Design a protein around this ligand. Structure first.
Ligand SMILES: [Mg+2]
Ligand SMILES: [Mg+2]
Ligand SMILES: [Zn+2]
Ligand SMILES: [Zn+2]
Ligand SMILES: [Zn+2]
Lengths: 87, 112, 559, 95, 269, 168, 171
RNA sequence: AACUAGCUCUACUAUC
DNA sequence: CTACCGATAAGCACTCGGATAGTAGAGTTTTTTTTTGGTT
DNA sequence: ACCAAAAAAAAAAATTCTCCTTCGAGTGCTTATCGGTAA
């Protein structure tokens, strides 16, 4: 009942961004830049939005933060960059 | 001991031919059946008549009568089950849905 | 582009509450006070009489009333009217529960048999799960057929104080189909002090009793005060559903296509008006009860067709009338055919053959069917050239389009396309075009037995309409090449097509979690060939090895 | 073509929830209605041209929200309370 | 019926397993947290063999002539003899191994060695051997202290429960005990020097690869494992043809008890 | 939800409704009374807000005679984009008329004197309803003014501040 | 009347505006919709408080599209008209049945019968002239009229008050 | 560019 | 001797029954009467 | 004056047995009922 959140310390969630989260972020940015969002990573004349998003993820300048839930109801969050992508 | 024996039996049945499958599946099955203080068969009236969301229950072998019972008891559902979303036509907290997608400003400021 | 935009906030739905209708509020939300049992052609021209069938509710066709909300027909969610009944009637679903309740409460005073002075009902109150305590109370109040007034004898030292309302004795209760009766045996004031009085209970009596129960006793019995109070168990003011649940199909020559339920409603209205006029005049009091029985019968049938089989509720045709329960009953009724599973758009189905040349992840797709389906995008500073080329191409060659969706909801057909070489497609627009190559796509072969039987695929475009795929992926689909078929699905937004390219691509499905060993493989042709090759006693000459080294796409270029 | 139980179940196994929603909604009903949170019911009446959305009976010119649900589901609801039984809200109530 | 019974049940971001009510059914999914993919029929080694064979495979003592190793394997293979620190550490390792042997003999009465486990160690050993042109002649540069520490360090760094309290620590040790015992079995000092011959560089390489793969092997938090299990068990049910009941009727009998067995016979020893 | 009315049709006594709850929650979670200030106090707060956007708009640029104040607020509007905020003007036209004292100094001094007293803002706020300082008219209008305390007590409190103030 | 309190508003941002300047864009937008607001509950919202230090904590991307939603909490200056109160104001519009007083933002309309009897007005035929106590017909023409009926049907507050009561009428 | 195909009732098949 | 459970069985009363496809074929009130307009 | 179409108004609805008929499956809920037993 007390504000149902947590500081960015003492976080018990895994430090590895999971494949579901990967696909979600990729699709979200694909739709985002798809309908003319501001782009951040320099293009190479590559037209496909989804591959642009993948290049952004590899280059790691994604301006997103990921929300995270626990069965109790209290939530937790992360920023994309502090996660590490391996999968 | 009951769950142990039941797992043994079902593993025997499956391994009788065309074996096999990983132990974890059977373990999960026997447990989710037995975590009730007893045991319950998977019938129209074994597990379905148990404290659980309304719609997902009514989506199996018990069409309307269950709704009547719900309305009479006037209970409520929080719709955190997959069915409840599906009937409700909203993204259920599944896979990609198991988390929210949140936005930040400060990173946007930092990298312009 | 806005579906007739509404300036109202939108939000998801997080919670659903279940309950009954209190008669007063359902009457409040009503719009019609339906009297006439006729439906259409007043005297008898057009413009359905202000009885049934929109006095002031859901429109009919091309007349945008919507109860004068002008919200066409597609927008019209419907509106409700209400009907009135001379006498209270039961509710077939709500019969066993009401019987248990009646046994549980002491009529003629409107009180509980058991009250917090024995331990037993106290523990029953203690077990507050939701409902089981109701069963406990029911099985504890089966006995004590007589209402008491001074129960507590030994909790207090020897005395006894007053808690009971009446000194009367509650008759035993039974039911016969649509009706229930009480048995006043009572061991006194009866036939030879033993022969009981068999009296059929009057509904309204029960309903008065039901009001007289105290509020907390509902909680005791599990009724939620604000949402389900027992007196609402009985039906008094039956609500009326709107038109869009009872269409007028007009089956193919000139019929009116009147549904089963609307005839049922007309019949019940006839019953109501008949009972009203009968009782209003000199009631002989030997037919009014029959009118009551008939009216309850009709409402019962309308609420449900399939009570214990003493009646059948046959229609005026011979097939039995069809009610709500039958309408939405399981197995293709309104849930498993119309809610949980559906017919979708953007799909195709055909027969298939092998291909020893297409790579594993793609799928052979037929040029014509490729033109048939479509897919929208959004106009970008990146896609403008290609999109322009396609819309120039037209809807009658592969790399083409079929619709242009601009900023506003302006569907522009390219089949007519009186201005083909005109449009220039400024930014932020949507263009539905054909399926070019390397597009994500869903492939599936019902029945589905495991995680596989449906994965993603890239797309090649092939003549000779059929489907083509790789021999390797065969076994997981468990499909032949004799005459079998699969099903095709195509995403509709960038989000989804992305969502498929990372969790359903057959590259990502090599190892089956089901049996912790790969579900892929190679099959009879290639297997036999490799065995006939990779054995010591064979060899090869110069030409063929060169052709082989050229065959492998990933050849380094070294002999 | 028909989308069936087991197909949906396999989708669930994959977990492509967003694709599930899109395929089940846009290839299908994709209907929109407003409700009265005070009602929790399916009964509000609107005047798009007049920008009025009042729920008569609940006489509230504020408690208005629009929800995207499948036409089939709302249908279900009409016969459901026509069967005389279902409130709806738009937020938690127990935490 | 099966698929309609375990829809909601799944794994949340606490490595736990709840229905759509929050009821826990598996505190750790599969009691391992290892995804169903990352399993091989890898071969355990400690359980098998005879006591003498086990001793010869693992026992080693510098101060004794019998189980001592040849100095030629180690660059510092001669002067290493005599130190009390090294002998003490080796004895501690041997005690750990024999305790593990007792444990495994307890867990499996049959003693069958092959079992389904997370990430393999064999393959990485072979490819490490290849990736450095390791020969059969040169001695080994890495020292005993190196490996005897690194083994514990690696088994410690493996993490499945990102916790901080006591109970989580207990479970985390518990949840990985079999894998750590197996790893200890495969990475015996005697085995390493006498057959594996690894260099210190390659040793660090394999340690890092082991850790990376193990982290790769965690269950992805957020899949609907219950549906997967149900559909998986269902699949073979159809694909099967056929004085003791068996087959699909028996399957239904257990799955739907139905207190009537027709073969209720029982076994007595 | 059974209509959850808990409301009363507004009266001269200002009977507070549920949605105008007497004790209101806060985002931080503190519980406090329904924040209301008299006709006098609001005007200076508005002036402070206006001068705050004055600094904010001189920051945006580098990228007592009510009419000039209206045009100044208009300038606040057009510094961002062309001002069509007519209703804000018309209310602001009456905003100085909301304030009991027209001159800035008189209303301000009334505020600093009342803040020490801690008197209910309703009592002094009822003053500016009509252009009248005679109390008898207000006592006739609002009986609760007589009921809560007699008139003469009202003026023995009032004359401490009415001396500095000059009405419209 | 003068109630100042923190208010929460839901704001949807189109994704194309996802630039580092968005915070300024959000502040500007909130300025347009909030200022001059006239809601049924709070009456008409006249201006915000403490323009800087408003909390914009974070935002949720809509699942269907790039639209992002933000919930913001801000203190503001708002007036709430209340019934039973007497306000003098300009007679902007003149009608034969009864003079219509515009009390600043909100409007007051009164008929001939509501008109006070102690202060006899010739209001039936036309807007009342100069008579017994005092009454005027000009554009400024402030007339003391009560408020007894508040209507929030439209995006504004309309007030009606009977004038046949103790001390009601122009003086 | 005038905007709709369309219900149930039994028989036969198609893969599995 | 006497209600006081009570466990046992008998009954009786329940509702359930693979996934898709594609056909084509017949009938979706009946009879009786009265009325009145087409007819010669 | 003849009559024919058609629309409107009412009911054909009785033979008889329980055969319905094989769907039998189980399971759960109700009810009789000997049967014992402590006061
Ligand atoms: Mg529940
Ligand atoms: Mg075949
Ligand atoms: Zn309407
Ligand atoms: Zn009584
Ligand atoms: Zn309402």
């Amino acid at each position: 009942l007390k504000e149902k959140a947590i500081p960015k310390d003492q976080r018990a969630t895994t430090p590895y961004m999971t494949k579901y989260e990967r696909a979600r972020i990729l699709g979200t940015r694909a739709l985002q830049i798809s309908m003319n969002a501001p782009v951040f990573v320099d293009l190479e004349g590559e037209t496909d939005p989804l591959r642009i998003a993948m290049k952004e993820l590899a280059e790691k300048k994604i301006p997103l933060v990921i929300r995270r839930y626990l069965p109790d109801g209290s939530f937790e969050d992360w920023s994309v960059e502090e996660l590490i992508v391996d999968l | 001991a009951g769950r142990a024996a039941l797992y043994k039996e079902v593993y025997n049945v499956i391994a009788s031919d065309g074996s096999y499958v990983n132990y974890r599946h059977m373990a999960l099955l026997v447990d989710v059946m037995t975590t009730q203080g007893g045991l319950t068969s998977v019938t129209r009236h074994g597990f379905n008549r148990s404290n659980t969301g309304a719609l997902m229950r009514c989506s199996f072998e018990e069409t309307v009568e269950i709704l009547f019972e719900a309305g009479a008891s006037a209970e409520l559902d929080d719709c955190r089950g997959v069915s409840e979303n599906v009937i409700l036509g909203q993204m259920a907290p599944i896979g990609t849905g198991a988390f929210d997608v949140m936005i930040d400003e400060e990173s946007l400021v930092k990298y312009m | 582009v806005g579906q007739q935009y509404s300036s109202a906030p939108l939000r998801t739905v997080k919670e659903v509450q279940f309950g009954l209708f209190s008669p007063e509020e359902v009457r409040a939300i009503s719009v019609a006070k339906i009297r006439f049992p006729e439906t259409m052609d007043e005297t008898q021209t057009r413009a359905k009489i202000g009885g049934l069938n929109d006095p002031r509710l859901g429109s009919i066709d091309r007349n945008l009333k919507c109860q004068t909300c002008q919200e066409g027909m597609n927008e019209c969610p419907g509106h409700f009217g209400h009907i009135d009944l001379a006498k209270p009637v039961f509710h077939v679903g709500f019969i066993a529960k009401i019987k248990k309740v009646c046994e549980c409460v002491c009529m003629h005073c409107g009180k509980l048999l058991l009250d917090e002075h024995n331990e037993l009902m106290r523990q029953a109150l203690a077990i507050k799960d939701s409902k089981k305590r109701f069963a406990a109370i029911w099985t504890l109040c089966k006995t004590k057929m007589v209402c008491e007034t001074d129960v507590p004898s030994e909790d207090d030292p020897t005395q006894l104080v007053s808690r009971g309302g009446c000194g009367n004795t509650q008759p035993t209760i039974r039911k016969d189909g649509l009706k229930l009766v009480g048995s006043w045996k009572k061991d006194r004031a009866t036939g030879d002090a033993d022969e009981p009085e068999l009296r059929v209970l009057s509904t309204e009596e029960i309903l008065n009793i039901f009001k007289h129960i105290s509020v907390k006793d509902f909680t005791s019995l599990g009724f939620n005060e604000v949402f389900s109070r027992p007196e609402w168990m009985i039906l008094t003011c039956l609500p009326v559903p709107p038109p869009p649940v009872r269409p007028s199909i007009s089956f193919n020559e000139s019929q009116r296509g009147e549904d089963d339920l609307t005839f049922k409603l007309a019949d019940i209205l006839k019953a109501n008006i008949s009972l009203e006029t009968l009782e209003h005049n000199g009631a002989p009091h030997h037919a009014i009860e029959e009118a009551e029985s008939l009216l309850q019968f009709h409402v019962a049938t309308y609420m449900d067709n399939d009570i214990a089989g003493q009646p059948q509720a046959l229609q005026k045709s011979g097939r039995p009338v069809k009610s709500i329960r039958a309408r939405l009953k399981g197995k293709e009724g309104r849930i498993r055919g119309n809610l949980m599973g559906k017919r979708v758009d953007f799909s195709a189905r055909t027969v298939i053959s092998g291909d020893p040349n297409l790579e594993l992840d793609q799928v052979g797709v037929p040029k014509s069917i490729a033109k048939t389906l479509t897919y929208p995008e959004v106009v970008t500073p990146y896609n403008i050239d290609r999109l322009t080329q396609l819309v120039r191409n037209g809807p009658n060659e592969h790399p083409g389009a079929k619709y242009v969706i601009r900023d506003s909801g302006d569907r522009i057909d390219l089949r007519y396309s009186k201005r083909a070489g005109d449009i220039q497609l400024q930014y932020g627009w949507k263009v539905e075009r054909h399926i070019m190559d390397n597009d994500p796509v869903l492939f599936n072969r019902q029945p589905s037995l495991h995680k596989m039987s449906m994965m993603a695929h890239r797309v090649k475009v092939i003549p000779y309409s059929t489907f083509r795929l790789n021999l390797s992926v065969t076994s997981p689909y468990n499909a032949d090449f004799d005459g079998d078929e699969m099903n095709l699905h195509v995403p509709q937004s960038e989000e989804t097509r992305a969502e498929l390219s990372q969790l359903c691509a057959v590259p990502l499905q090599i190892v089956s979690p089901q049996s912790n060993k790969p579900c892929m493989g190679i099959v009879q042709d290639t297997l036999c060939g490799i065995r006939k090759l990779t054995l010591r006693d064979t060899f090869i000459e110069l030409d063929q090895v060169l052709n082989m080294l050229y065959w492998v796409p990933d050849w380094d270029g070294v002999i | 073509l028909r989308f069936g139980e087991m197909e949906r179940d396999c989708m669930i196994a994959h977990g492509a929830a967003s694709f599930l929603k899109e395929r089940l909604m846009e290839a299908s009903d994709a209907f929109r209605v407003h409700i009265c949170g005070i009602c929790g019911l399916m009964t509000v009446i609107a005047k798009l041209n007049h920008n009025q959305f009042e729920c008569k009976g609940c006489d509230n010119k504020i408690d208005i929200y629009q929800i995207h649900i499948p036409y089939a589901a709302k249908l279900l609801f009409q016969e459901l309370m026509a069967m005389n039984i279902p409130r709806l809200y738009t937020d938690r109530s127990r935490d | 019926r099966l698929v309609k019974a375990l829809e909601d049940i799944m794994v949340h971001y606490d490595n736990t397993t709840r229905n759509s009510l929050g009821n826990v059914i598996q505190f750790i999914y599969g009691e391992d947290g290892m995804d169903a993919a990352h399993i091989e029929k890898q071969s355990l080694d400690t359980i098998g063999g005879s006591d003498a064979a086990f001793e010869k495979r693992y026992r080693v003592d510098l101060l004794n002539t019998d189980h001592t190793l040849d100095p030629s394997l180690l660059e510092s293979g001669s002067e290493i003899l005599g130190d009390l620190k090294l002998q003490v550490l080796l004895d501690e390792e041997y005690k750990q191994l024999v305790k593990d042997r007792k444990f495994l003999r307890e867990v499996f009465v049959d003693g069958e060695a092959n079992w389904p486990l997370p990430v393999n160690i064999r393959r990485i050993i072979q490819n490490a051997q290849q990736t450095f042109h390791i020969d059969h002649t040169k001695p080994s540069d890495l020292t005993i202290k190196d490996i005897v520490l690194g083994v514990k360090d690696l088994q410690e760094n493996l993490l499945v429960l990102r916790g901080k309290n006591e109970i989580i620590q207990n479970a985390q040790r518990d949840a990985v005990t079999l894998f750590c015992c197996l790893l200890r079995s495969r990475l015996a000092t005697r085995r390493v020097l006498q057959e594996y011959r690894l260099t210190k560089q390659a040793f660090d390489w394999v340690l890092s690869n082991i850790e990376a793969q193990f982290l790769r092997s965690v269950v992805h938090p957020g899949e609907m494992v219950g549906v997967l299990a149900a559909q998986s068990i269902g699949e073979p049910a159809t694909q099967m043809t056929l004085k003791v009941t068996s087959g699909v009727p028996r399957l239904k009998e257990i799955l739907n008890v139905a207190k009537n067995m027709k073969t209720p016979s029982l076994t007595v020893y | 939800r059974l209509k959850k009315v808990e409301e009363e049709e507004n009266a001269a006594t200002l009977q507070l409704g549920q949605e105008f709850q007497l004790k209101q929650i806060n985002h931080q979670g503190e519980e406090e009374e329904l924040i209301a200030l008299n006709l006098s106090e609001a005007r200076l707060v508005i002036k402070e807000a206006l001068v705050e956007r004055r600094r904010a708009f001189k920051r945006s640029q580098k990228k007592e005679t009510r009419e000039k104040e209206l045009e100044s607020i208009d300038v606040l509007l057009e510094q961002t984009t062309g001002g069509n905020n007519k209703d804000l003007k018309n209310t602001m036209q009456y905003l100085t008329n909301f304030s009991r004292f027209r001159d800035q100094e008189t209303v301000g001094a009334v505020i600093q004197l009342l803040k020490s007293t801690g008197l209910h803002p309703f009592e002094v706020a009822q003053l500016g309803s009509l252009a009248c300082d005679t109390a008898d008219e207000a006592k006739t209008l609002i009986p609760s003014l007589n009921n809560k305390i007699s008139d003469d007590e009202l003026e023995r409190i009032l004359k401490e501040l009415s001396n500095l103030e000059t009405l419209y | 009347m003068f109630f100042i309190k923190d208010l929460s508003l839901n704001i949807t941002l189109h994704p194309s505006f996802f630039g580092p300047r968005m915070k300024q864009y959000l502040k500007t937008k909130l300025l347009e919709e909030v200022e001059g607001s006239c809601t049924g509950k709070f009456g008409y919202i006249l201006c915000v408080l403490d323009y800087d230090n408003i909390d914009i904590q974070r935002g949720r991307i809509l699942p269907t599209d790039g639209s992002a939603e933000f919930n913001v909490k801000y203190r503001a200056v708002v007036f709430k008209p209340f019934k039973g109160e007497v306000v003098d104001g300009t007679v902007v519009s003149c009608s034969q049945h009864g003079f219509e007083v515009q009390v600043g933002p909100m409007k007051v309309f009164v008929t001939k019968h509501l008109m006070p009897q102690d202060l006899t007005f010739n209001a039936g035929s036309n807007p009342p002239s100069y008579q017994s106590s005092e009454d005027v017909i000009t554009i400024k023409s402030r007339i003391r009229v009560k408020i007894e009926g508040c209507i929030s049907q439209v995006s504004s507050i309309h007030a009606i008050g009977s004038i046949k009561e103790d001390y009601l009428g122009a003086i």
